[PDB]
């Protein structure tokens, strides 16, 4: 019978080689995930459909910010084959009230708080 | 001596960048044909359709007439652009 | 060629974020700026909501960490007080 | 440019004659070249309804 | 000649299917994306104990808003102006 | 590391040697100056321009007509500047933006000639043997603009 | 006159004669017709690009079905260039 | 016959007006004309996707023709123009190929320039100076 | 459908924008009724909007004819000779205002399929492509395999 898959915990224990490859320090982990649905929930189990709806990833290629916490991570583990997860980067820090209207999420995963649309 | 494309046909392309590098300029003056690359000016239904096909390198089918239906369907005042 | 754009940090689709789409499409010949485009207004609203969610999530996680630290304190100094 | 309408149209939709030498050549590659030229797919003004084909002479 | 018995792709004797380099590359690309997903999921920020109850207030307020919306369902108001405006159908000139 | 000349000892394509950066930048400057002097002296006739308007790119020239498939919230006969010009070209030279040309470089002006609704478009949905038949008539707002001028300035 | 052609508006006969007269007034050697390009000469759909060379310099070239027609069209092109009414001329300033 | 339909003429005409240009009895008989007209409207609705697809295919074919005239393949031209950061779309590129042959020659020369710069960079992999046309204008 | 309908090319009446914009609409005849629910909106339009529209568009003559009518109408006559008759039957003031403004902003050209979203009288500035463009010339114009 086809059932829900229990991912062994060893899969989610990064190695030093993984750290070097993907550029992430085990200490000081990132706070937020940018998650984009890159796969259709069609032809996938209803539980994956429901998890996608819960995470609010109904539209494909639409980034969504999520907490990097154990429960959200469990849901993302359930639907990990349909999504792309990246760490949200804040080169200029968190947006403030003043610059809340000038933000932009660049394809690199950086939320720039000044968007001038002018040459550097 | 490097040229992105041969400059013996059509314009002679010369690419450039502005100092700021935010726009690409292209100087492409047309090339005239050299005088030496020029020559001096020189100084029944079945048989009909076969002759026309041989003349215009087409098949026989197009030279046959069409019916009144198609003839009157054709638009005699087509829209004209430019 | 969206992969090259991604490598350069631009949107994979040139129709995405950038001057080509986010700049005003026109302006009055007098020079007066044109009213904001509907698509640009919607995009700005979406980015504002995204930024506000980012701030909210980060603030909530920071507050949770601070609360957990405070609770661990409470436990530690309590334990010590009833030990003494 | 600066041509009259009819001469310009004639020049644009004129059929050119190309020569292929088949000596020691793969018939498939010869056929690919000939098909492109015959269809006119080598012309920027190409269109299936424009009858923009060209003549190909293979020796 | 060259018949597949019955219906292709379903029976015991199906039409053979072969993976192209294109398909292999596509699958490898998806696998790489998922490996990166594993890496980024392997580094949680808070622990379960640290997260316990850190969104309880917001979640409760959101459900309170939902409950208020559910319980505020009531027939709309009715105005004398709406009823009397129908008399304008026979509004004429002089 | 020498390899005797064989059919596969060297790549089939010719070996290209790009110009050295210093001399090539000098040539860049020379060509840019030449084109700038052409613009100053007005050695051009008709100018065409690839301009990004609405959501599309239009190849445009003075006296051209453009049909934008929507209303622009502009009174008819009103003049506008098309600000997203990707390319401006003449008989002898063309200027390309990266990806957009400068305002000080190009000024394309249009006039809102007409505001109209498109001819009725039929949207028909049908599925056999399901009593599934639906019809809708949609008219899309449109604006015809006439491109009055394409002006370039010596700012290269 | 927008979209109109010089000789569409001003009907002329013997454009070669007009061009010869104009070049004589401008003190330029009489043009020499020269077959720059040709295609399908012996067919029923020939193309002839005939160029007018003065002092071994191309003043204009015109296409045609026959050599005479191509020469006439090249004369028309040369006249347009001399009179400054080329198709790519500066648009009228309104 | 308390209530009878008196508009059936116009109800039939509303359909037959769109079938007058058909062939055979489909342009006269309502029982057939309605079927043919429904099929025609469905085809018209579905043909907009095909119109866009065929427009792009035609533009690609014409761009391929022009790039082959200039010695380049369509993938090379398009990719290298993108790398040069020129965002001309296929419609405009085909229009340029047809009506501005010298501009298209300039664009093809630029594409080949960028292609050769990329080849040189790959061959001399390292921190060698970036190609003059390979530099990317950053936006912020 | 396109094949069952006439078509035209994008065009202007007299190059409407080159020198000056000329409002193509010239006449607007509003047939209205004193009585009849169908023309209530038309009556309100005549009372509250027609004057403002007339002063906004001084180049359009407006003829408001109040006669017994079951279907109030507006006939728009354009400089080019086109006549467009629209029913304002049971249309509110806002609907009538929008319809009239659309007629004012619209040219007299037929509302049919437009073959091209653009129209250029000078499509080429560098020379329309012909097969001999991008083709090099040979010495003495010798065709291939020619001996002399
Ligand atoms: Mg079978």
- Helices (H) then strands (E): counts for chain C: 3, 1
Given a contact cutoff of 8 angstroms between Cβ atoms, the answer to whether H109 and H72 are in contact is: no
Residue whose C-alpha is closest to residue B35's, from A17, E6, G51: G51
Give the distance, in angstroms, between the CA of residue H47 and the centroid of all CA atoms in the same chain: 13
B57: left (phi over 0), alpha (psi -120 to 50) or beta: left
Contacts of F57 in chain H (CB under 8 A): 87-89, 91-92
Phi, psi of G49 (to 5 degrees): -95, 110
Resolution in A: 2.7
Residue E7 CA to ligand 1 centre (angstroms)? 4
Please state whether the peptide bond connecting residue C64 to the residue before it is cis, i.e. omega within 30 degrees of 0: no
Burial class (CB in 10 A: 0-12, 13-18, 19+), B68: exposed
Residues 18-47 of H with CB under 8 A from B: 21, 23
| Token couple for F113 | 């000639």
I89 part of contact set with chain E, CB < 8 Å: no
- Answer yes or no: are the C-beta atoms of C24 and C34 closer than 8 Å: yes
CA dist F65 and F88 (Å) reads 17
User: What angle, 0 to 180 degrees and rounded to 10, lies between the N-to-C axes of helices A70-78 and E21-41?
Assistant: 160
Six-digit token string for H89: 């779309």
Helix (H) or strand (E) holding A67: strand A64-67
> Does any CB of chain B come closer than 8 Å to the CB of residue F40?
no
What is the chain B residue with the closest CA to H134?
B21
Classify residue F47 as exposed, middle or buried by CB count within 10 Å of its CB (0-12, 13-18, 19+): buried
Q: Which CATH number fits domain I1-148: 3.40.30.10, 3.60.15.10, 3.10.20.90, 3.50.30.60?
A: 3.40.30.10
Residue count of chain B? 82
A 8-47 residues with CB < 8 A to E: 11-14, 18, 21-22, 24, 26, 29-31, 33, 38
F62 touches chain G (CB under 8 A): yes
Neighbours of H48 (CB within 10 A): 11
Placement of tokens 């960079």 in the chain: H121
Nearest 5°: the CA angle H25, H28, H32 is 60
Q: What is each CA distance from D11 to D3, G61, G68, in whole angstroms?
A: 10, 12, 15
Contact (CB, 8 A) for F100 and F85:
yes
Instruction: For A82-109, give one letter per residue: b (16+ CB within 10 A) or e.
Output: bbbbbbbebeeebbeeebbebbbbbbeb
What range does the domain containing H91 cover? 1-140
Task: Give the pair of three-digit tokens for residue B3.
Answer: 């040229």
Give the integer Cα–Cα distance in Å for G16 and G39: 23
For residue I29, the tally of other CB atoms under 10 A from its CB is 16
Contact B23, F100 (CB under 8 A): no
What is the number of CB-based contacts under 8 A between chain H and chain I? 34
Phi, psi angles (nearest 5°) of residue G48: -130, 115
- Show which subunits contact B, needing at least 3 CB pairs below 8 angstroms: F, G, H, I
**Helices marked H in A25-89:** 46-55, 70-78
Q: Which is nearest to F70 in space by CA: F25, F20, F115?
A: F115
Cβ–Cβ under 8 Å, residues I125 and D1: yes
- Residue A64: helix, strand or coil by DSSP? strand
Phi–psi pair at B26, nearest 5 degrees: -135, 120
Please enumerate in sequence order all residues whose Cβ is within 8 A of that of F152, keeping only pairs 6 or more positions apart, or say none: F39, F44, F47, F88, F90, F95, F105, F106, F107
Length of chain I: 148
Q: How many CB atoms lie within 10 A of CB H128?
A: 10
Contacts of F12 (CB under 8 A, 6+ apart): none
Helix-then-strand count for chain H, H and E: 5, 0
Q: Is residue F30 within 8 angstroms of chain G, CB to CB?
A: no
Answer whether H129 touches B (CB < 8 Å). no
The residues, any chain, with a CB within 8 Å of residue I63's CB and separated by 6 or more, are: I27, I28, I29, I30
The rounded distance, in Å, linking the Cα atoms of F51 and F60 is: 7
d(CA A50, CA G55) in angstroms, rounded, equals 83
Assess C11–A contact: CB distance below 8 Å, yes or no: yes
Query: How far C75 CA lies from chain A's nearest CA (Å)?
Result: 24
Longest dimension (CA), chain B: 74
Nearest-5° Cα angle at H17, H12 to H19: 95
Asked if H102's CB is within 8 angstroms of B30's CB, the reply is yes
List chains adjacent to chain I, taking adjacency as at least 3 C-beta pairs closer than 8 Å.
B, D, E, F, G, H
Look at residues C9, E46, E40, E30 and name the one whose alpha carbon lies nearest to residue A21.
E40
DSSP H84-133: HT----HHHHHHHHHH-HHHHHHHHHHHHHHHHHHHHHHHT-SSPPPPTT
D13 in Cβ contact with H35 (< 8 Å): no
Q: Find the chain C residues whose C-beta atoms sit closer than 8 A to any C-beta of F.
A: 14-15, 18-20, 23-31, 34-35
User: What string of H, E and C letters represents the secondary structure of chain G?
Assistant: CCCCCHHHHCCCCCHHHHHHHHHHHCCCCCCEEEEEEEECCCCCCCEEEEEEEECCEEEEEEEECCHHHHHHHHHHHHHHHHHCCCCCCCCCCC
G contact chains, 3+ CB pairs < 8 A: B, D, F, I
Q: Are F133 and F126 in contact (CB under 8 A)?
A: yes
Q: Using DSSP bridges, classify how beta strands A32-37 and A64-67 pair: parallel, antiparallel or unpaired.
A: antiparallel
- What separation, in Å, do the N-terminal and C-terminal C-alpha atoms of chain I show? 60
H18 sits in which H/E element: none
| CB-nearest partner of I34 from E88, E89, E92 | E92
Q: Is any Cβ of chain B less than 8 angstroms from the Cβ of I112?
A: no
Neighbours of F73 (CB within 10 A): 11
Inter-chain contact B30–F92, Cβ cutoff 8 Å? yes
Measure the CA–CA gap between I81 and E85, rounded to whole angstroms.
42
Could you please report the per-residue DSSP string of F17-29? Answer: -PPPHHHHHHHHH
Placement of tokens 């492409």 in the chain: B28
Residue F90 near residue F46, CB atoms below 8 Å? yes
Experiment type: cryo-EM
Q: Hey, what are F11's tokens?
A: 């790549």
The DSSP element (H or E) to which A43 belongs, if any, is: none
What sign does the dihedral F76-F81-F86-F89 (CA atoms) show?
positive
Residue in the block written with tokens 């403030």: A96
DSSP annotation string for F64-129: -EEEESS--S--TT-EEEE--EEEEE-SSEEEEESSS--TTTEEEEEEEEEEEEPPPEEEEEEETT
Closest alpha carbon within chain B to I136 = B9
Partners of residue A60 on adjacent β-strands: A37
- Which of I137, I140, I141 to mutate to test binding with chain B, by most B CBs within 10 Å of its CB? I137
Beta strands D17-20 and D55-58 are parallel
Q: Under 8 Å CB-to-CB from A110, ≥6 apart: which residues?
A: A89, A90, A91
Q: In whole angstroms, how far apart are CA G85 and each of D3, E63, G1, G78, G79?
A: 11, 77, 11, 10, 9
* C-alpha radius of gyration, chain G, whole number: 14
Closest listed residue to residue B25, CA positions, set B33, B15, B11: B15
In 3D space, the residue among I12, I119, C36 whose CA is nearest the CA of residue F77 turns out to be I12
Residue H27 per-residue DSSP state = G
Contact call for residues B15 and H116 (beta carbons, < 8 A): no
Chain F: residue whose CA lies nearest to B30: F92
What does the alpha-carbon distance between residue F95 and residue F105 come to, in Å, rounded to a whole number? 9
Q: Which residues of D touch H65 (CB under 8 A)?
A: 41-44, 46
Q: In this complex, do I40 and E93 lie within 8 Å of one another by their Cβ atoms? A: no
* Phi, psi for E43 (deg, rounded to 5): -130, 75
Residues D6-30 as b or e (16 or more Cβ within 10 Å = b): ebbebbbbbbbebebeeeeeeeeee
Integer Cα distance of C37 and C26 in angstroms = 10
Q: Is A86 on the interface with E (CB under 8 A)?
A: yes
Cα G85 to its chain centre, rounded Å, is 12
- Max Cα-Cα span within chain H: 95
Which candidate in C22, C57, C59, C60 is best for mutational testing of the A interface (most A CBs within 10 A)?
Answer: C57
Task: Write the DSSP symbol of residue I117.
Answer: S
Report angle CA H133, H136, H138 to the nearest 5 degrees.
150
Interface contact A53, partner E, CB < 8 A: no
Q: What's the distance, CA C67 to chain centroid?
A: 24
CB contact (8 A) between residue I139 and residue B80: no
**No. of H helices and E strands in chain D?**
2, 2
- Tell me the C-alpha distance between I129 and I135, whole Å: 11
Distance CA E46, CA A30 (A): 10
For residue E3, report the distance from its CA to the centre of ligand 1, in Å: 7
From CA A38, how far away is CA A52, in angstroms rounded?
A: 11
Instruction: Decide: A35 and A63 in contact? Cβ < 8 Å.
Output: yes
Q: What are phi and psi of F115, to 5 degrees?
A: -125, 125
Chains touching chain E, criterion 3+ CB pairs below 8 Å: A, C, I
Please tell me which residue of chain I has the smallest CA distance to H94: I129
Query: In DSSP terms, which residues pair with G53 in a beta bridge?
Result: G32, G58
Q: Which domain does C30 fall in, by range?
A: 1-84
- H118–chain C Cβ distance below 8 A for any pair: no
C-beta separation of I103 from I84 below 8 A: yes
Chain breaks in chain G (C to N over 2.5 A) after: none
Instruction: Inform me whether the C-beta atom of residue G88 falls under 8 Å from chain D C-beta atoms.
Output: yes
Tell me which chains share at least 3 CB pairs under 8 Å with chain A.
C, E, H
CA distance readout (Å), A16 to A19, A24, E41, G83: 5, 10, 15, 78
Phi-psi region of F73 (alpha: psi -120 to 50; beta: other; left: phi over 0): left
**Domains of chain A: which residue ranges?**
1-117
Which of F102, F66, F100 has its CA nearest to residue F86?
A: F100
Number of H helices, E strands in chain A: 3, 5
Q: What tokens were used for B6?
A: 């041969």
Listed by number, the residues of chain C in 6-25 with a beta carbon closer than 8 Å to a beta carbon of chain H are 8, 10, 14, 18-20
Q: How far is it, in rounded angstroms, from Cα F30 to Cα F145?
A: 38
CB A31 within 8 A of CB A67: yes
Query: In this structure, what token pair is assigned to residue I28?
Result: 């607007």
Please choose, from the candidates A113, A114, A111, A115, the residue with its C-alpha nearest in 3D space to the C-alpha of residue A32.
A111
Q: Give Cβ neighbours of residue H62 (< 8 Å, ≥ 6 apart).
A: D44, D45, D46, H94, H97, H98
Q: Which residues of B touch G (CB under 8 A)?
A: 32-33, 35, 37-42, 55-57, 82
The residue whose two tokens read 């429960």 is A71
* Among F52, F48, F60, F41, residue whose Cα is nearest residue F90: F48
Chain H contact set for A117 (CB, 8 A) = 139
Residue closest to F126 by CA, chosen among H37, A67, H27: H37
F-chain residues within 8 Å CB-CB of C24? 83
* N-to-C CA span, chain C: 71
CA F11 vs. chain centroid, Å, equals: 37
Nearest to I129 among D3, D12, D19 (CB): D12
Tell me the Ramachandran region of residue I134: left when phi exceeds 0, alpha when psi lies from -120 to 50, beta otherwise: left
d(C-alpha D18, C-alpha B32), whole Å: 23
Q: Is the dihedral of CA G19, G20, G26, G28 positive or negative?
A: positive
**F149 interfaces chain G, CB cutoff of 8 Å:** yes
Contact B37 I133 (CB under 8 A): no
H120 — contact with chain F (CB < 8 Å)? yes
- Run of H or E residues at A115: none
């Amino acid at each position: 019978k086809f059932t829900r898959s229990r991912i062994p915990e060893k899969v989610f224990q990064a190695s030093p080689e993984d750290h070097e490859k993907y550029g992430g320090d085990p200490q000081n982990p990132h706070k937020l995930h940018i998650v984009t649905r890159i796969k259709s929930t069609r032809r996938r189990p209803y539980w994956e459909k429901d998890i996608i709806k819960m995470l609010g990833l109904e539209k494909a290629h639409t980034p969504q910010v999520h907490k990097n916490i154990p429960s959200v991570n469990a849901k993302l583990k359930v639907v990990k084959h349909l999504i792309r997860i990246k760490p949200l980067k804040l080169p200029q820090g968190l947006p403030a009230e003043e610059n809340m209207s000038n933000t932009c999420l660049k394809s690199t995963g950086e939320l720039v708080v000044q968007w001038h649309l002018k040459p550097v | 001596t490097y040229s992105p494309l041969p400059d013996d046909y059509n314009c002679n392309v010369e690419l450039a960048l502005t100092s700021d590098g935010r726009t690409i300029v292209c100087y492409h003056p047309s090339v005239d044909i050299p005088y030496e690359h020029t020559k001096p000016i020189p100084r029944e239904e079945g048989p009909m359709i076969e002759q026309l096909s041989k003349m215009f390198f087409t098949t026989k089918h197009r030279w046959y007439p069409h019916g009144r239906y198609h003839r009157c369907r054709k638009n005699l005042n087509p829209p004209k652009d430019r | 060629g969206g992969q090259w754009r991604l490598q350069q940090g631009l949107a994979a689709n040139p129709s995405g974020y950038g001057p080509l789409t986010e700049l005003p499409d026109w302006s009055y010949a007098d020079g007066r700026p044109a009213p904001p485009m509907k698509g640009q207004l919607r995009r700005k609203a979406e980015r504002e909501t995204f930024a506000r969610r980012v701030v909210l999530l980060s603030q909530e996680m920071d507050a949770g960490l601070q609360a957990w630290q405070l609770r661990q304190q409470k436990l530690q100094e309590e334990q010590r007080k009833q030990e003494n | 440019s600066s041509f009259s309408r009819a001469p310009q149209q004639w020049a644009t939709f004129a059929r050119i004659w190309y020569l292929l030498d088949g000596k020691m050549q793969p018939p498939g590659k010869l056929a690919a070249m000939a098909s492109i030229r015959l269809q006119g797919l080598h012309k920027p003004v190409y269109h299936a309804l424009s009858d923009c084909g060209d003549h190909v002479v293979i020796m | 000649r060259g018949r597949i018995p019955g219906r292709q792709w379903i029976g015991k004797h199906r039409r053979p299917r072969f993976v192209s380099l294109r398909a292999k590359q596509n699958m490898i690309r998806r696998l790489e994306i998922e490996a990166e997903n594993h890496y980024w999921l392997s580094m949680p920020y808070m622990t379960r104990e640290q997260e316990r109850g850190h969104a309880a207030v917001r979640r409760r307020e959101a459900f309170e808003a939902i409950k208020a919306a559910a319980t505020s369902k009531f027939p709309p108001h009715r105005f004398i102006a709406d009823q009397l405006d129908h008399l304008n159908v026979t509004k004429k000139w002089s | 590391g020498y390899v005797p000349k064989t059919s596969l000892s060297s790549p089939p394509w010719p070996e290209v040697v790009l110009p050295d950066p210093v001399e090539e930048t000098r040539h860049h400057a020379e060509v840019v100056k030449k084109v700038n002097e052409m613009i100053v002296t007005g050695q051009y006739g008709r100018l065409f321009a690839v301009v990004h308007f609405a959501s599309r790119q239009w190849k445009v020239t003075s006296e051209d007509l453009i049909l934008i498939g929507n209303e622009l919230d502009l009174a008819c006969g009103e003049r506008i500047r098309l600000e997203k010009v990707l390319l401006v070209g003449a008989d002898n030279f063309t200027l390309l933006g990266k990806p957009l040309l400068g305002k000080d470089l190009v000024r394309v002006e249009a006039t809102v000639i007409e505001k109209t609704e498109s001819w009725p478009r039929i949207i028909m949905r049908f599925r056999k043997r399901k009593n599934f038949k639906k019809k809708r008539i949609v008219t899309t707002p449109q604006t015809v603009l006439r491109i009055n001028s394409i002006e370039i300035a010596p700012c290269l | 006159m927008t979209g109109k052609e010089l000789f569409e508006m001003w009907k002329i006969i013997n454009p070669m004669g007009l061009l010869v007269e104009e070049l004589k007034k401008r003190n330029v050697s009489a043009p020499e017709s020269r077959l720059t390009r040709q295609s399908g000469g012996t067919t029923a759909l020939p193309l002839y690009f005939v160029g007018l060379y003065c002092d071994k310099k191309l003043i204009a070239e015109g296409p045609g079905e026959t050599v005479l027609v191509a020469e006439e069209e090249a004369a028309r092109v040369a006249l347009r260039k001399l009179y400054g009414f080329t198709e790519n001329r500066r648009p009228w300033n309104y | 016959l308390r209530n009878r339909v008196t508009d059936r003429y116009f109800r039939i005409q509303e359909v037959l007006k769109h079938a007058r240009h058909f062939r055979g009895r489909k342009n006269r008989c309502y029982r057939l004309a309605v079927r043919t007209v429904i099929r025609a409207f469905v085809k018209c609705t579905k043909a907009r996707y095909l119109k866009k697809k065929n427009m792009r295919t035609l533009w690609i074919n014409r761009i391929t023709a022009a790039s082959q005239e200039h010695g380049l393949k369509y993938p090379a031209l398009i990719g290298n123009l993108v790398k040069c950061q020129v965002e001309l779309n296929r419609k405009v590129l085909a229009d340029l190929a047809i009506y501005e042959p010298k501009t298209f020659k300039s664009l093809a020369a630029l594409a080949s320039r960028r292609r050769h710069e990329g080849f040189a960079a790959a061959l001399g992999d390292g921190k060698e100076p970036e190609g003059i046309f390979s530099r990317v204008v950053q936006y912020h | 459908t396109a094949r069952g309908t006439p078509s035209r090319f994008l065009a202007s009446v007299l190059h409407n924008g080159l020198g000056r914009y000329v409002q193509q609409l010239q006449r607007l005849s509003f047939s209205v009724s004193r009585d009849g629910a169908s023309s209530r909106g038309a009556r309100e339009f005549v009372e509250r909007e027609v004057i403002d529209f007339a002063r906004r568009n001084p180049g359009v003559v407006i003829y408001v004819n109040s006669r017994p009518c079951c279907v109030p109408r507006v006939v728009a006559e354009y400089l080019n000779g086109a006549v467009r008759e629209e029913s304002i039957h049971c249309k509110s003031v806002e609907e009538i205002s929008t319809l009239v403004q659309k007629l004012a902003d619209q040219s007299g050209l037929d509302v049919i399929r437009i073959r091209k979203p653009f129209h250029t009288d000078n499509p080429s500035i560098q020379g329309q492509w012909h097969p001999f463009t991008n083709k090099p010339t040979t010495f003495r114009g010798l065709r291939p395999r020619e001996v002399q």
